[PDB]
Design a protein around this motif. Structure first.
Motif, PDB file in Angstrom:
ATOM      1  N   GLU A   1      19.097  43.520  40.344  1.00 58.64           N
ATOM      2  CA  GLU A   1      19.899  42.907  39.256  1.00 58.64           C
ATOM      3  C   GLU A   1      20.781  43.967  38.597  1.00 58.64           C
TER       4      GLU A   1
ATOM      5  N   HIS B   1      17.207  48.481  40.685  1.00 59.62           N
ATOM      6  CA  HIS B   1      16.840  47.050  40.848  1.00 59.62           C
ATOM      7  C   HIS B   1      18.011  46.254  41.473  1.00 59.62           C
TER       8      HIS B   1
ATOM      9  N   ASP C   1      20.647  49.425  35.380  1.00 63.12           N
ATOM     10  CA  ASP C   1      19.327  48.988  35.883  1.00 63.12           C
ATOM     11  C   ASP C   1      19.081  49.472  37.301  1.00 63.12           C
TER      12      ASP C   1
ATOM     13  N   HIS D   1      15.145  52.690  36.202  1.00 59.07           N
ATOM     14  CA  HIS D   1      13.715  52.856  36.499  1.00 59.07           C
ATOM     15  C   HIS D   1      13.509  54.034  37.449  1.00 59.07           C
TER      16      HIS D   1
ATOM     17  N   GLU E   1      17.459  44.938  29.211  1.00 60.28           N
ATOM     18  CA  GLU E   1      17.602  44.150  30.458  1.00 60.28           C
ATOM     19  C   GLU E   1      17.465  42.645  30.153  1.00 60.28           C
TER      20      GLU E   1
HETATM   21 MN   LIG Z   1      15.355  45.172  36.377  1.00 61.09          MN
END
Ligand SMILES: [Mn+2]
Ligand SMILES: [Mn+2]
Ligand SMILES: [Mn+2]
Ligand SMILES: [Mn+2]
Ligand SMILES: [Mn+2]
Ligand SMILES: [Mn+2]
Lengths: 356, 356
Positions: free
Chosen positions: B313, B311, B308, B12, B241
């Protein structure tokens, strides 16, 4: 032609049409599940609501003679090469969508008394699931305890519980405690508790068959994340008729949240989510090749086979053709685990001579 | 000490706070997604609605500096051993819960122009996902075509589409045709679109992490069962994801419906659901060991590794250590397929120079 002997972790019994008519208190009789067969149509009524409308063709396709006559059922088990068999309800499942705790409790007592006296009595190869109130914990504990004193080995819970009675709530703790004390397997069968006719556009049949997975996965996540399984190491749960390979996927999903989102996690668990799943969560399937890969490659050893007799989605009457193709080239230890040994860990039937 | 080059199918970017405020006309510029981090929580505003009010851990959930400084992000790619990386929106994802198609269309154009001009320009190792309207097909096809001319390789769709715009509906056919024509991968990122179910009780953090799977499984079921993928053999779909091992499990579930409920199945497909899944449906994961068993034991070859970033996670800053543990004793051909080759089948980055 039935050389591979199997135990079936999933099947259903059609109740006598008059089961509740004869046995309920007069005040309750008219509110019990009842059906009208007219035009092409069977309509099922539960406590002043139409809950089901089908053409008689589909309805009667899941009603071969064994689905009704328990003498023919036992002969079909021999014919299909099935030894032991767990038996779930059919009309009894509508107790899970009732809103009146008294109607549900009384209809469950009737069902549980009929199944033991009139069906489980024919052969020790039959392992019935006792129903317990989805609506009231004291009603569910009392019936679990009565069902156990009667020699029941498992209780049925609907995959979608009533609103505010999700499986992570404190309201279930007395039931987990009583099931663990009794050595009762908790059997959660999918497609129960709600409505699964949610998809209406192109691909509805296939989309709806997938939607019924979601309550199963949610139930596992709630039982694992809430500490229910952690607090009750003797408590085993069977997820019936949802397939298998999503269970280790979910073990991994929960582990990732537990480890990477730990600062938001409550309660803490004594072991990781995946360790609880691999210890205590079992899952049945009829046709899924992926169930074998779950055992061999994902260290998920809690896979049981089921016929889901007499449903369309089950193996009948091609049980031997399905399982022989499923297990062609497969380690016999794995075929033994999936088709026999997981069943006998959960459920007591007379032991066959264990060929490898 | 030793590192292995990987490509990542998921990360992201955090958009400038004033991206939309500075670029949109007065009728729109105050209604675009706005994130406030203040007093231990994150608040998101979209078109006069509080869409999110989530706790932050000002101590233990602290954001990587590279989330806030794109020069540190590029140092972090090299440090983590990541060559190519797909980049999804952050604040931009809130365009998927907008009810105004004008605001959504215009906010999407501003995002797609900014990402290309100011972020993707930093390195061709970055593969941007262009947003397209979830609300209006003409707007979505227009922007996909404009994005394709701009060199975009994939479009982002939210996992939960607006009510009445489910992925099995005719309304999407023009976008499936346009994506296939353009060779554009459709990337469905989970946890996006209106929030269907939210768990409030014990185990909520783990339960909510599982709940985000259900829209992804639903989307795959809608795309396969509707014939969307069958009619567009050139259309590839990446589920970002959501993990991997549920994807072959869902192939099996859909095959069982297709074969045993054939009489209720419309439309007919030119091949079984599971063949369409194995041909056209890809899926990413960060930590899930089961994703490797999906490849080695379930004949599901469309697994891609993702970081990811940034984040919680995701893997940062332990990417190499995570991949080392995942692939201990695994065929290197399987490590190459999961960590490099699937990524270069879907996406084009510059040549990774060789070592030795
Ligand atoms: Mn995520
Ligand atoms: Mn069943
Ligand atoms: Mn069948
Ligand atoms: Mn302030
Ligand atoms: Mn992501
Ligand atoms: Mn992390």
């Amino acid at each position: 032609m039935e050389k591979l002997w199997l135990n079936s972790a999933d099947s259903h019994v059609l109740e006598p049409d008059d089961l509740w008519e004869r046995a309920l208190p007069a005040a309750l009789r008219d509110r019990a599940p009842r059906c009208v067969r007219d035009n092409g149509r069977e309509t099922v009524y539960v406590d002043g609501q139409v809950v089901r409308r089908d053409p008689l063709d589909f309805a009667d396709a899941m009603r071969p003679p064994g689905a009704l006559d328990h003498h023919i059922r036992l002969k079909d088990l021999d014919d299909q090469g099935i030894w032991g068999e767990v038996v779930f309800p059919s009309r009894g499942l509508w107790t899970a969508v009732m809103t009146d705790p008294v109607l549900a409790r009384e209809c469950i007592k009737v069902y549980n008394d009929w199944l033991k006296s009139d069906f489980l009595s024919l052969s020790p190869r039959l392992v019935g699931a006792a129903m317990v109130s989805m609506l009231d914990t004291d009603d569910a504990v009392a019936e679990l305890r009565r069902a156990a004193d009667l020699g029941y080995q498992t209780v049925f819970l609907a995959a979608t519980p009533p609103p505010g009675r999700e499986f992570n709530m404190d309201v279930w703790e007395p039931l987990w405690a009583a099931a663990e004390e009794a050595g009762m397997t908790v059997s959660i069968h999918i497609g129960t508790g709600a409505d699964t006719v949610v998809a209406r556009g192109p691909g509805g049949a296939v989309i709806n068959y997938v939607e019924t997975l979601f309550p199963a996965q949610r139930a596992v996540a709630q039982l694992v994340a809430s500490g229910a399984l952690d607090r009750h190491p003797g408590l085993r749960v069977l997820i019936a008729e949802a397939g298998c390979a999503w269970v280790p996927a979910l073990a991994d999903r929960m582990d990732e949240a537990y480890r990477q989102h730990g600062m938001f996690v409550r309660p803490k668990l004594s072991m990781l989510p995946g360790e609880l799943v691999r210890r205590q969560v079992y899952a049945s399937f009829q046709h899924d090749e992926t169930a074998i890969g779950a055992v061999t490659a994902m260290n998920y050893t809690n896979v049981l086979w089921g016929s889901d007799y007499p449903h369309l989605e089950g193996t009948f009457p091609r049980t031997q053709e399905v399982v022989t193709e499923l297990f062609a080239g497969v380690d016999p230890e794995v075929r033994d685990l999936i088709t026999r040994r997981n069943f006998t860990d959960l459920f007591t039937v007379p032991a066959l001579p264990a060929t490898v």
